[PDB]
Design a protein around this ligand. Sequence first.
Ligand SMILES: *[C@@H]1O[C@H](CO)[C@@H](O[C@@H]2O[C@H](CO)[C@@H](O[C@@H]3O[C@H](CO[C@H]4O[C@H](CO)[C@@H](O)[C@H](O[C@H]5O[C@H](CO)[C@@H](O)[C@H](O)[C@@H]5O)[C@@H]4O)[C@@H](O)[C@H](O[C@H]4O[C@H](CO)[C@@H](O)[C@H](O)[C@@H]4O[C@H]4O[C@H](CO)[C@@H](O)[C@H](O)[C@@H]4O)[C@@H]3O)[C@H](O)[C@H]2NC(C)=O)[C@H](O)[C@H]1NC(C)=O
Ligand SMILES: *[C@@H]1O[C@H](CO)[C@@H](O[C@@H]2O[C@H](CO)[C@@H](O[C@@H]3O[C@H](CO[C@H]4O[C@H](CO)[C@@H](O)[C@H](O[C@H]5O[C@H](CO)[C@@H](O)[C@H](O)[C@@H]5O)[C@@H]4O)[C@@H](O)[C@H](O[C@H]4O[C@H](CO)[C@@H](O)[C@H](O)[C@@H]4O[C@H]4O[C@H](CO)[C@@H](O)[C@H](O)[C@@H]4O)[C@@H]3O)[C@H](O)[C@H]2NC(C)=O)[C@H](O)[C@H]1NC(C)=O
Ligand SMILES: *[C@@H]1O[C@H](CO)[C@@H](O[C@@H]2O[C@H](CO)[C@@H](O[C@@H]3O[C@H](CO[C@H]4O[C@H](CO)[C@@H](O)[C@H](O[C@H]5O[C@H](CO)[C@@H](O)[C@H](O)[C@@H]5O)[C@@H]4O)[C@@H](O)[C@H](O[C@H]4O[C@H](CO)[C@@H](O)[C@H](O)[C@@H]4O)[C@@H]3O)[C@H](O)[C@H]2NC(C)=O)[C@H](O)[C@H]1NC(C)=O
Ligand SMILES: *[C@@H]1O[C@H](CO)[C@@H](O[C@@H]2O[C@H](CO)[C@@H](O[C@@H]3O[C@H](CO)[C@@H](O)[C@H](O)[C@@H]3O)[C@H](O)[C@H]2NC(C)=O)[C@H](O)[C@H]1NC(C)=O
Ligand SMILES: *[C@@H]1O[C@H](CO)[C@@H](O[C@@H]2O[C@H](CO)[C@@H](O)[C@H](O)[C@H]2NC(C)=O)[C@H](O)[C@H]1NC(C)=O
Ligand SMILES: *[C@@H]1O[C@H](CO)[C@@H](O[C@@H]2O[C@H](CO)[C@@H](O)[C@H](O)[C@H]2NC(C)=O)[C@H](O)[C@H]1NC(C)=O
Ligand SMILES: C[C@@H]1CN(c2ccc(C#N)c3ncccc23)C[C@H](C(=O)N[C@H]2CNC[C@H]2F)O1
Ligand SMILES: C[C@@H]1CN(c2ccc(C#N)c3ncccc23)C[C@H](C(=O)N[C@H]2CNC[C@H]2F)O1
Ligand SMILES: *[C@@H]1O[C@H](CO)[C@@H](O)[C@H](O)[C@H]1NC(C)=O
Ligand SMILES: *[C@@H]1O[C@H](CO)[C@@H](O)[C@H](O)[C@H]1NC(C)=O
Ligand SMILES: *[C@@H]1O[C@H](CO)[C@@H](O)[C@H](O)[C@H]1NC(C)=O
Ligand SMILES: *[C@@H]1O[C@H](CO)[C@@H](O)[C@H](O)[C@H]1NC(C)=O
Ligand SMILES: *[C@@H]1O[C@H](CO)[C@@H](O)[C@H](O)[C@H]1NC(C)=O
Ligand SMILES: *[C@@H]1O[C@H](CO)[C@@H](O)[C@H](O)[C@H]1NC(C)=O
Ligand SMILES: *[C@@H]1O[C@H](CO)[C@@H](O)[C@H](O)[C@H]1NC(C)=O
Ligand SMILES: *[C@@H]1O[C@H](CO)[C@@H](O)[C@H](O)[C@H]1NC(C)=O
Ligand SMILES: *[C@@H]1O[C@H](CO)[C@@H](O)[C@H](O)[C@H]1NC(C)=O
Ligand SMILES: *[C@@H]1O[C@H](CO)[C@@H](O)[C@H](O)[C@H]1NC(C)=O
Ligand SMILES: *[C@@H]1O[C@H](CO)[C@@H](O)[C@H](O)[C@H]1NC(C)=O
Lengths: 750, 749
Amino acid sequence: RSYPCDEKKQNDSVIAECSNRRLQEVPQTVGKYVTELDLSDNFITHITNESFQGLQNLTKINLNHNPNVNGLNITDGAFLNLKNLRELLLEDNQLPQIPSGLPESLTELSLIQNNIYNITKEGISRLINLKNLYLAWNCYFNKVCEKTNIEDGVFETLTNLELLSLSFNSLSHVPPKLPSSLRKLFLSNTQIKYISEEDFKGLINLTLLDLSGNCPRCFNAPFPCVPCDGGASINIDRFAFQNLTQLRYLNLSSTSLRKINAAWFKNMPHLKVLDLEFNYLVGEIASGAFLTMLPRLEILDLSFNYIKGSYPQHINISRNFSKLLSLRALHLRGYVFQELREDDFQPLMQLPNLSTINLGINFIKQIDFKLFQNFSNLEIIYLSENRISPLVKDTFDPHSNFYHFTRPLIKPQCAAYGKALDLSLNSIFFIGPNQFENLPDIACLNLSANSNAQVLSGTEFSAIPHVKYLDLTNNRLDFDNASALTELSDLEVLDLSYNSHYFRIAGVTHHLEFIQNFTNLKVLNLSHNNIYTLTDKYNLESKSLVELVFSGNRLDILWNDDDNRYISIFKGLKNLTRLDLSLNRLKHIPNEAFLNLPASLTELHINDNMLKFFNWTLLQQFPRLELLDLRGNKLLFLTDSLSDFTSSLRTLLLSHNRISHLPSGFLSEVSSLKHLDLSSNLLKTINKSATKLSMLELHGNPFECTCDIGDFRRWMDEHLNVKIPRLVDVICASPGDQRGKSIVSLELTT
Amino acid sequence: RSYPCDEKKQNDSVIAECSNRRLQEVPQTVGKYVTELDLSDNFITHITNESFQGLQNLTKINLNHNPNVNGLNITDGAFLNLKNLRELLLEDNQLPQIPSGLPESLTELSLIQNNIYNITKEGISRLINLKNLYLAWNCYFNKVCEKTNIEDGVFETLTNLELLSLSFNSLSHVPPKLPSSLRKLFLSNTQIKYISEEDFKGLINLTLLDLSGNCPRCFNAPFPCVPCDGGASINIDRFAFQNLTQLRYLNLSSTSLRKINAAWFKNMPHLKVLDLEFNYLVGEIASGAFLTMLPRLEILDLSFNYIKGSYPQHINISRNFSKLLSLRALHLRGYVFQELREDDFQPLMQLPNLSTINLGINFIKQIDFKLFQNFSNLEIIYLSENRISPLVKFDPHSNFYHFTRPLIKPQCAAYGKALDLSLNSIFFIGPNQFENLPDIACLNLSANSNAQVLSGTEFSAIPHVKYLDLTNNRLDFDNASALTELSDLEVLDLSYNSHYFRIAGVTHHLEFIQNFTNLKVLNLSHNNIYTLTDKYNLESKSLVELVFSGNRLDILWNDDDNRYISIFKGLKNLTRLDLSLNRLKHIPNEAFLNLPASLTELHINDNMLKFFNWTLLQQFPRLELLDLRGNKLLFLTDSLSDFTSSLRTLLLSHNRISHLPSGFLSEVSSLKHLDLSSNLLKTINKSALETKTTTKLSMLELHGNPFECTCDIGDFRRWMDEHLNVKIPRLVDVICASPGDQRGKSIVS
Ligand SMILES: *[C@@H]1O[C@H](CO)[C@@H](O[C@@H]2O[C@H](CO)[C@@H](O[C@@H]3O[C@H](CO[C@H]4O[C@H](CO)[C@@H](O)[C@H](O[C@H]5O[C@H](CO)[C@@H](O)[C@H](O)[C@@H]5O)[C@@H]4O)[C@@H](O)[C@H](O[C@H]4O[C@H](CO)[C@@H](O)[C@H](O)[C@@H]4O[C@H]4O[C@H](CO)[C@@H](O)[C@H](O)[C@@H]4O)[C@@H]3O)[C@H](O)[C@H]2NC(C)=O)[C@H](O)[C@H]1NC(C)=O
Ligand SMILES: *[C@@H]1O[C@H](CO)[C@@H](O[C@@H]2O[C@H](CO)[C@@H](O[C@@H]3O[C@H](CO[C@H]4O[C@H](CO)[C@@H](O)[C@H](O[C@H]5O[C@H](CO)[C@@H](O)[C@H](O)[C@@H]5O)[C@@H]4O)[C@@H](O)[C@H](O[C@H]4O[C@H](CO)[C@@H](O)[C@H](O)[C@@H]4O[C@H]4O[C@H](CO)[C@@H](O)[C@H](O)[C@@H]4O)[C@@H]3O)[C@H](O)[C@H]2NC(C)=O)[C@H](O)[C@H]1NC(C)=O
Ligand SMILES: *[C@@H]1O[C@H](CO)[C@@H](O[C@@H]2O[C@H](CO)[C@@H](O[C@@H]3O[C@H](CO[C@H]4O[C@H](CO)[C@@H](O)[C@H](O[C@H]5O[C@H](CO)[C@@H](O)[C@H](O)[C@@H]5O)[C@@H]4O)[C@@H](O)[C@H](O[C@H]4O[C@H](CO)[C@@H](O)[C@H](O)[C@@H]4O)[C@@H]3O)[C@H](O)[C@H]2NC(C)=O)[C@H](O)[C@H]1NC(C)=O
Ligand SMILES: *[C@@H]1O[C@H](CO)[C@@H](O[C@@H]2O[C@H](CO)[C@@H](O[C@@H]3O[C@H](CO)[C@@H](O)[C@H](O)[C@@H]3O)[C@H](O)[C@H]2NC(C)=O)[C@H](O)[C@H]1NC(C)=O
Ligand SMILES: *[C@@H]1O[C@H](CO)[C@@H](O[C@@H]2O[C@H](CO)[C@@H](O)[C@H](O)[C@H]2NC(C)=O)[C@H](O)[C@H]1NC(C)=O
Ligand SMILES: *[C@@H]1O[C@H](CO)[C@@H](O[C@@H]2O[C@H](CO)[C@@H](O)[C@H](O)[C@H]2NC(C)=O)[C@H](O)[C@H]1NC(C)=O
Ligand SMILES: C[C@@H]1CN(c2ccc(C#N)c3ncccc23)C[C@H](C(=O)N[C@H]2CNC[C@H]2F)O1
Ligand SMILES: C[C@@H]1CN(c2ccc(C#N)c3ncccc23)C[C@H](C(=O)N[C@H]2CNC[C@H]2F)O1
Ligand SMILES: *[C@@H]1O[C@H](CO)[C@@H](O)[C@H](O)[C@H]1NC(C)=O
Ligand SMILES: *[C@@H]1O[C@H](CO)[C@@H](O)[C@H](O)[C@H]1NC(C)=O
Ligand SMILES: *[C@@H]1O[C@H](CO)[C@@H](O)[C@H](O)[C@H]1NC(C)=O
Ligand SMILES: *[C@@H]1O[C@H](CO)[C@@H](O)[C@H](O)[C@H]1NC(C)=O
Ligand SMILES: *[C@@H]1O[C@H](CO)[C@@H](O)[C@H](O)[C@H]1NC(C)=O
Ligand SMILES: *[C@@H]1O[C@H](CO)[C@@H](O)[C@H](O)[C@H]1NC(C)=O
Ligand SMILES: *[C@@H]1O[C@H](CO)[C@@H](O)[C@H](O)[C@H]1NC(C)=O
Ligand SMILES: *[C@@H]1O[C@H](CO)[C@@H](O)[C@H](O)[C@H]1NC(C)=O
Ligand SMILES: *[C@@H]1O[C@H](CO)[C@@H](O)[C@H](O)[C@H]1NC(C)=O
Ligand SMILES: *[C@@H]1O[C@H](CO)[C@@H](O)[C@H](O)[C@H]1NC(C)=O
Ligand SMILES: *[C@@H]1O[C@H](CO)[C@@H](O)[C@H](O)[C@H]1NC(C)=O
């Protein structure tokens, strides 16, 4: 670690981190060692020939977000210097023009979120070895520019260009004279309404094309959005893509398509993913004209093609959907329909490869759960945000994808265990006794936020006893009855976060006895169940359990139990490694209670409590403990003799406490501490009296910079490997002459 | 000037409000005219004959909740002085016995929430004159007491007792030897499992009986709740109520009743109100035994009687329901069923007096709204907490079982026929959503995640809507047509609306508001409005109130083209304006001068103001209330007497004020009420508020100030004692801060 840039080594290339250090010029310490430089989130506004000299070993400069609040001054040839400069990022800098005078060694140039309106030869016709060029957000509702002007041939010379991102800019036409070497052409939100034959004449190599937000369909647009001539459509000629033989991805989101010409995929048997969401294509879904041309598609998205004023009975799926033999996921979010039958999805049932169906936000009230058994390999069923009821009787970031969320539908940690079903945000206020009948073998089940008030008695998941991951978060479930969920003999993950039932009985209040007949349950989350009361004893004997979260409960109220009934409330869980006691409003954990914790614990969090006094001396029973998180507490003091107490602990987060005095016998035991966190306490000074540590957090402590402090800065220098995060945020409170400056940029003994 | 009690005139005598003054003992500082003394919610730990010597004239004493944060120590006859004592409340005092020297003249005695496990004749029986007696929560799960020991017939020579409350007291027998004069008897949650025949005899006079919470059914109980043996209901002998001819009120809420012995009501021609929520009577609802013994019943609650596991297809309503001819209110919550069709409700359509139909929490999937026309006196239809879809092509003095709040906001109910459709699944407004409804005047569509794009044709089917509640939805109204099919509309509530159609340059269009000639209120709180897109003049001759909090005026008035100066000047009639929570720091001078001069209340509390230009108030002749609480104001003005003569109330608590100017208000002065609490005042140098003529000022609040009480304060504390016509509230919150020997209480010291 040198000041002002924390330094670390990756590969045979030294990287320098000077981001968010608030500096106003190119730093000084940066040795010729450095090869990739990071300068983002600063207050720099000047870049000269002198800024970058001597460093010639540099291949890269980050430099985005400068200054942070005219723009940022770049001098003709301030970079012409370095013959190693590969990548050069300059996003969000308020640049008026394209840096005049630039290195040829440049491969990947970024220039987005600036004020470049002229695109000129004088700027970029020299960077031949340019590969990836980004230029989104440059004439995007600035009104000091009608069109992003591009001068002819500004792309025909950059013969090594693979990627061009002109998305989110104001062009009316498609830039002529591009290089045939192109592979990705991003042009979203560019205001193109006419697409010619010529526009894409001879990019025979192009793989991805992105034409969204052209004539948008402003459902929930996270940015300025303006529709075409009423319900007007982006107008695409049939021979627009004749040449585009090599092509995997097509994103035609928000174009307001009504009719899909099927002449477009005539010469393109390649295409792997089609995005046709936020359009008007209900007719085309039903009359699948193009649906014939796509045998190698694996993912299809037709989401938010719903018609205003409409709520059909059923969803009209063309037969031409059985020509989609390669499909692996289908995305049908927000058609909006009332009932799904076996019939309606008939065309998809003889599709061999289809493994995800996405039906969320379709506000559907009834589905035949049988119809899902006629699939040959499905393990994702997403039905979130529909109106399924209890069943009775019947046996900002531009680097992102705006039109298609890339987060997993289900949690991987769940989609692991087998077939995943998501019934979250539905109307299942209790569990109908027919709720699960005709369901495939379910491994992963989400019932999140159904305000489900079901008394559980162990009957309810009988149709599906083979569940592993079950998520019941945000519900009003009762499980005072000990038979509760016990049908689920294979269950490993129970997520019961935030549950208040409606059947409090006195002396039955909370009854966890039901945990004990699990032979296989590993993760148990009971956060925010507001338990202040057990009628099950303190013995919860289970060797299955590894991790228990017990946040948002009332541990205090239990441990003030006047007859002392609640001491070993966790002893029985012998195999517990991780435990979580945060937000239980704890003041004094009685000594005998703390000593009755699984001797097996690896992590222990008692943070965001009200803790005053910690009896450190009790850490001797916990010899596997690697992490102790005591953050957000009212702790004053630290044991002078940590030696006596532990030799297993690796991480000790203490921040947001009221620690004034850091004692003398720190590092008295082989403390195994690589990571020590003391930031946001009440430290005036660190004495002299106080090599295995790589991290120390001190930021935001009232430092008293008097020379009395200078012992510490000698230690910060003898021991130079131990990194301090945001050094520049460890500051002087005092004295007056000092208040504001960093401990490190401090002229000492004067 | 009274200390410490605020001393009000009421009817013909003097109240003393000494409640909640951190008081530790009764002051002998209260007057002699006082007949009523509230000493509630204080820290008093003792009571003796020296406590209340001086005022034999007292009739009522409060005392409740003393002390706070041990017990209350009453000696034998601390009240035997008080010859004029009618009332005496003593609830929440950790009392170990019944006080032992009370006067006869007691005719109302409340001793709830104490620690009296036994009732002795030494204490009460010699109190012949009592009329009311409340004894709830005394043996209420102590682990000390199994039983609320009642001396056999302790109540026998209480021959005037009208109201006896014994609720929430573990005694499984109805005490014997009761007084005949009893009209009202409460026995809720007493663990009385069996009601004999001899239990109620001699109570010819009884009009109310309370027996709920015995053999409870524990749905949502907000206290300890313990079911009887297995699923066992209460047991009441056939001839229990043989003698109770005069009974009007009968609570059997949560008794677990499967079966209603229609023989209980043989002698009760009179019964008006029947509470039977929280039992298991789906069947007794299907086939009404009792339903015929009740001609004169006006109110019937059978809420939360559903069967668990079950979600039937229809509700089953005995035709035995048109024998309740008197019926005014019917409550049917938590039957839970899928569908109400016309014929299911045929038996109720032949009732003259029925106005309130309560169908809350039935999770109803669909309804034939036609059925509602076929009702004569229908006013409130309550359909909250159902499942309707878009149609296409702690307190012990309370009622625990019944919700006694208005089902519908009265302001709404006033206009007439009310339909509450809140907490349903109407995610947009179906083109057939209101076909075959009555003419509704008041409509609630709150909390339906309703995303409807409005075009002003969505409401054609019921176009006489005057009060429309649209809070907590996701409604677009950028179309100048939006809602215009509702010409008669008077109140529009759109709090908390965030749409999904943000087009740029249309953004937020507020043009639809120029249509209404009788729109009177409009609540636009919390819409995140920061972008508006029309010609300036919002033009509304009608509109009187605009709530505009939780928006971004700050953002709007910071416009560099000044496009939003005159954003509200077109609202000529407006007299109320709430501009709080806009995070405003500076209101531009021209932006303020373009508020309508008509305003009368202006609210800019809870923003971030530092400076306020008083001398603009001049353009505001009718202004009368100004509220700038929770801003950050520093400086006032020395000539405010010049810039406004209309202004009645000025509120400025929670600001950064320490200097009080040597002008202000004297002689040419601006009326009645001045709040200057939670400021930063050290001292006031009399130069503020001169004794020029007589300033009209009645009331002035200055509590929670950081006061400097050495000698400086000599001038004000004179001024106080001479302007007795100037009320300062809360003299026990006007504290010192400066002299470290004075920091606390004081000003009065
Ligand atoms: C009710 O309770 C349950 C249980 O308490 C809650 O769920 C648990 O929740 C935690 C918290 O989110 C989950 O942890 C997260 O899981 C992510 C995926 O993990 C796996 O994949 C990665 C890579 O594929 C592997 O490395 C992991 O394997 C490791 O194995 C063990 C753990 O078994 C570790 O000890 C090893 O060291 C290995 O790492 C997993 O198989 C994971 O991404 C995530 O990690 C980030 O966040 C944590 C902070 O919690 C950091 O410690 C960690 O360094 C990561 O942070 C960095 O980088 C990302 C980008 O990569 C940045 O965005 C971040 O800022 C960050 O710096 C974490 O481990 C856990 O899986 C889960 N358990 C269960 C039961 O599934 C419920 O949520 C709860 N209900 C609610 C909602 O209240
Ligand atoms: C979206 O915007 C709309 C527009 O504001 C909101 O609607 C307003 O909401 C307010 C605020 O809650 C409602 O006013 C409230 O109305 C109460 C009922 O009033 C009627 O009768 C009363 C008694 O029955 C009559 O006195 C009234 O007459 C008043 O009339 C003119 C007004 O027309 C006044 O100028 C007179 O002086 C009269 O007083 C009404 O006809 C009323 O109860 C209530 O006042 C209690 O409240 C206010 C606090 O704002 C005090 O001024 C007042 O002292 C009252 O309270 C003392 O009393 C109680 C128990 O009695 C203690 O428990 C309290 O602490 C308190 O100290 C208040 O007035 C208004 O009706 C309503 N407007 C409409 C169009 O319905 C919506 O809320 C809003 N939506 C939200 C949630 O976002
Ligand atoms: C089972 O069911 C039975 C009967 O159905 C329940 O018995 C009810 O118990 C509650 C206790 O919570 C009773 O409430 C209180 O009554 C007092 C006194 O009564 C009324 O007395 C006067 C004449 O009627 C008058 O002062 C009041 O009357 C009208 O007054 C105004 C008119 O200006 C009108 O607007 C009111 O609505 C009244 O109609 C008065 O109500 C009453 O004073 C109590 O309340 C209020 O005010 C005080 C302020 O000092 C405040 O602290 C309270 O919170 C409250 O706002 C209160 O309403 C109720 O009367 C009983 N019902 C009947 C019909 O007798 C029983 O509780 C149920 N069991 C259980 C355990 O749930
Ligand atoms: C239309 O869909 C096309 C294909 O979905 C979109 O291009 C995809 O775009 C995002 C770019 O933001 C890519 O994510 C970024 O990629 C780099 C390089 O692997 C990586 O560091 C990222 O973090 C992030 O993943 C994504 O790879 C890309 N997909 C492919 C496969 O080319 C585009 O989102 C669409 N248009 C709009 C406007 O949303
Ligand atoms: C089950 O459903 C809930 C609801 O969709 C999921 O929680 C969402 O989770 C994502 C990422 O974990 C969060 O960003 C959202 O805030 C959550 N939304 C809500 C409303 O809770 C959860 O991921 C699902 N769990 C499983 C087992 O996959
Ligand atoms: C319309 O329905 C909503 C939902 O019931 C009502 O608001 C509830 O109102 C009461 C009283 O103001 C509050 O205690 C609740 O917390 C409210 N909840 C919600 C969802 O806001 C509202 O009162 C009804 N409006 C009318 C016209 O009476
Ligand atoms: C896809 C549908 C479109 N919806 C609708 C809006 C307006 C309509 C009109 N006229 C309409 N007409 C018919 C059918 C649906 C309609 C709203 C709905 C929604 O509420 N979405 C939420 C879910 N949680 C996140 C957020 F995206 O999404
Ligand atoms: C009246 C219904 C009964 N409910 C039910 C719960 C569990 C059941 C099981 N097994 C059940 N089985 C059949 C029918 C209803 C059932 C719960 C539901 C509710 O959500 N209550 C909340 C709503 N607002 C506050 C509070 F009143 O109310
Ligand atoms: C990196 O390049 C610089 C510039 O030519 C050179 O002086 C230096 O020796 C190289 N780095 C090292 C120390 O290997
Ligand atoms: C592209 O289109 C032209 C049109 O004349 C065609 O002749 C040429 O061969 C095409 N190139 C391909 C498909 O590689
Ligand atoms: C594809 O199927 C649809 C509906 O089943 C039909 O409209 C269309 O003609 C089919 N396409 C062909 C036959 O090319
Ligand atoms: C708990 O659930 C079991 C299984 O359904 C049920 O039989 C039992 O009655 C319940 N509890 C008891 C002991 O009453
Ligand atoms: C486990 O499961 C059975 C249900 O078959 C139940 O009878 C038994 O009591 C359970 N044990 C518990 C609650 O630990
Ligand atoms: C019953 O009440 C009446 C008035 O309602 C009263 O006059 C009568 O004395 C009471 N009955 C007896 C005899 O106690
Ligand atoms: C009341 O009506 C019910 C249902 O229609 C019926 O079972 C019962 O016999 C009626 N009671 C009589 C006839 O008294
Ligand atoms: C219905 O209400 C009126 C209004 O007070 C009342 O006079 C009448 O007696 C009631 N009719 C019956 C007997 O139900
Ligand atoms: C409404 O029609 C019903 C038939 O369900 C009929 O019995 C009823 O009398 C009609 N309403 C009235 C009160 O006229
Ligand atoms: C607004 O509504 C009218 C009538 O329903 C319609 O003709 C007009 O085109 C609408 N469009 C908008 C959002 O301006
Ligand atoms: C304006 O509102 C006041 C009440 O606020 C009312 O008296 C008057 O009639 C209204 N006048 C007009 C012009 O609508």
